[PDB]
């Protein structure tokens, strides 16, 4: 339907509209935001997982009959969709390179989109230097991590987007979470992270499978590891606080809705307790490694690398992942697997990890047999998309 533009102009008039956009965390932030606001305001209109273009958005308003809508919107669609919709609130999760790919082009798309509703507030991730790069017409509030600071340090040399947008010197960090996010500061000019309106002030307990943290004087717990879930939680809590929802209602809503983060993917092979983790890019893989580094037990590590259509043919990205972390982990033994068993074993040897404890397997079946016969009770498996499907499929045959 070309006339989807006419349905939106019509049906969207009678809603207070929140738009969630950015590179990553759009779906999870939207879902948790909907869960929390429901506790305060009852039924909330929202789009299915990933249905974040003109069609998915139009269909969402078509299923509904002074109400709130929280919509995930594809960055590229936003400038168009906001000539039809007039959102009251924009949430910016983050801005990172499309990996296939210019960050300031995808950024200009969401700046243009919000510019079309110049009175709407933007709630942005203050930890992203991109979100302080431009004079913005809309009113802006910022959320981020306001935990203990250290002296300015460079981010890891493989980090993207670390040039000062004002003076073209290299930014440093008094706190770095992942990628280019944190308490950024230019040592050459005045540019630095703005004062945060919404503050994660303490990390209480961060484990391989959970996190507890304080946002604006209240405690939250999620039953999944990894920093990116803490940002998605921070963003959703910030929206609820902007909407004036009470601390007691945010907690009740948070606890009922946090299952939308899912759980780590756990199963057993014989008497071994196993966790399977999808890897597809340098920042993601590096964050998986930092998470499993927190495990309070010895484990085997299996890395399964395929290069099929659905994985991406390119495996050069493993060289940018922080596999050097494996020398600072309680790892008993390493299995190198997938079709590219040879390249991933070479990538792990080059860390300086004992090469007598790195073993290639030509068949995923042999990885499973090796894990069943291993001494350590725990096994972690990091796999590309197709390696993960074949691995789950072989487990299903037992």
């Amino acid at each position: 339907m070309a006339c989807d533009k006419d349905i939106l102009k019509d049906l969207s008039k009678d809603y207070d509209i929140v738009v969630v956009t950015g590179t990553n965390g759009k779906t999870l932030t939207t879902a948790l935001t909907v869960g929390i606001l429901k506790e305060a305001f009852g039924e909330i209109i929202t789009n299915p997982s990933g249905a974040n273009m003109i069609t998915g958005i139009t269909s969402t308003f078509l299923a509904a009959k002074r109400q709130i809508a929280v919509l995930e919107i594809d960055e590229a669609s936003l400038p168009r969709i906001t000539t039809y919709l007039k959102p009251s609130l924009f949430v910016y999760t983050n801005i990172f390179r499309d990996q296939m790919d210019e960050i300031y082009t995808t950024y200009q798309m969401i700046v243009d989109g919000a510019r079309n509703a110049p009175k709407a507030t933007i709630l942005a991730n203050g930890d992203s230097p991109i979100f302080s790069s431009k004079d913005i017409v809309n009113p802006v509030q910022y959320y981020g991590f306001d935990t203990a600071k250290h002296a300015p340090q460079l981010a890891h040399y493989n980090t993207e987007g670390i040039l000062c947008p004002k003076c073209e010197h290299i930014l440093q960090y008094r706190l770095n979470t992942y990628a280019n996010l944190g308490d950024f500061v230019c040592l050459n000019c005045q540019f630095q992270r703005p004062t945060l309106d919404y503050q994660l002030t303490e990390l209480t307990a961060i484990t391989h499978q959970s996190s507890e943290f304080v946002i604006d004087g209240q405690n939250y717990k999620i039953n999944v590891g990894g920093l990116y879930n803490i940002y998605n939680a921070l963003a959703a809590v910030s929206v609820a606080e902007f909407f004036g929802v009470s601390p007691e209602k945010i907690k009740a809503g948070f606890n009922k809705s946090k299952a939308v983060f899912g759980r780590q993917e756990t199963f057993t092979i014989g008497d071994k307790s196993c966790t399977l983790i999808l890897i597809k890019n340098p920042v993601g893989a590096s964050q998986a490694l930092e998470m499993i580094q927190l495990a309070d037990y010895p484990f085997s590590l299996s890395v399964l690398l395929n290069a099929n259509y659905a994985d991406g043919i390119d495996t050069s990205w493993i060289w940018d992942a922080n596999f050097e972390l494996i020398t600072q982990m309680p790892i008993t033994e390493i299995n190198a697997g997938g079709v590219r068993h040879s390249e991933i074993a070479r990538r792990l040897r080059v860390t300086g990890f004992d090469d007598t404890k790195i073993k290639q397997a030509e068949k995923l079946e042999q990885i499973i047999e090796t894990i069943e016969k291993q001494e350590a009770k725990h096994a972690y498996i990091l796999a590309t998309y197709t390696a993960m499907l074949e691995f789950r499929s072989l487990l299903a045959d037992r």
Partner: protein
């Protein structure tokens, strides 16, 4: 300047190699920074303690401090900013190269050793101007795909993946890194890929090149150790330190 990477302090080594990872925090794309990890791996196998320093914008470069310079590729914006800093390192890099010290330069790093490169949109970015090659642009077209080259000076075959708009032309005082068996190489007019000039090795190869070609990794490190400690030293053989990588290496039988 800071140290990004260091061999373990508690292991013994008879040699010491220091690597300048030139703009390593700005020219950091396409896994090309993997070349640093391959040099460290091969150097340690040969009995060298490795120190890698990130020598980036506004950092002084002293040629006497380094045994290998690695200059990789980056995005167009980061490469334009690096180009503004280059004049500050020109004298020391010219002297480094003139002394037959080892450089590996990939994509943008290879282009920026030369006179200039031109972006797709026609904007000319001046390079160090220390070597005579230059890079023209292509308005719309890119060279993309698998490539294989053969260096006749060393009788070595290199494999990789190219993805560049740049069309590089070598000056009369340079050699190619190799002659194209299949793929585009520098410009699709001659059969040249990369550059070999003194102990400068340049390429458009992603891989990273030293992961896919341990013959070249071995060559760069042994060359650096023999420049530092003299040509009479005896290093472990290719076959003894890299037997497994040699056995598993991708190679094919295509001719041209």
């Amino acid at each position: 300047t800071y140290t990004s990477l260091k061999s373990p302090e508690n292991q013994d080594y008879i040699y010491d190699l220091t690597i300048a990872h030139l703009y390593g925090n700005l020219m950091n794309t396409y896994g090309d920074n993997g070349n640093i990890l391959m040099l460290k791996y091969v150097a340690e196998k040969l009995g060298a303690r490795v120190t890698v320093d990130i020598v980036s914008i506004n950092d002084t470069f002293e040629q006497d401090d380094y045994d290998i310079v690695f200059f990789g590729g980056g995005q167009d914006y980061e490469q334009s900013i690096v180009a503004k800093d280059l004049p500050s390192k020109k004298a020391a890099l010219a002297d480094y190269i003139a002394n037959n010290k080892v450089v590996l330069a990939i994509c943008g790093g290879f282009q920026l050793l030369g006179q200039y490169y031109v972006q797709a949109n026609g904007v000319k970015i001046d390079g160090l101007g220390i070597m005579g090659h230059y890079t023209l642009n292509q308005h719309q077209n890119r060279f993309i795909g698998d490539i294989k080259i053969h260096n006749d000076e060393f009788n070595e075959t290199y494999y990789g993946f190219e993805n560049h708009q740049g069309r590089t032309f070598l000056s009369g005082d340079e050699k190619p890194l190799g002659r194209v068996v299949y793929g585009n190489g520098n410009n699709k007019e001659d059969q040249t890929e990369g550059v070999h000039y003194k102990n400068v090795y340049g390429s458009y190869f992603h891989g990273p090149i030293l992961s896919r070609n341990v013959n070249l990794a071995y060559r760069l490190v042994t060359t650096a150790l023999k420049k530092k400690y003299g040509s009479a030293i005896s290093l472990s053989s290719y076959d003894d330190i890299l037997k497994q990588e040699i056995t598993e290496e991708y190679a094919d039988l295509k001719s041209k």
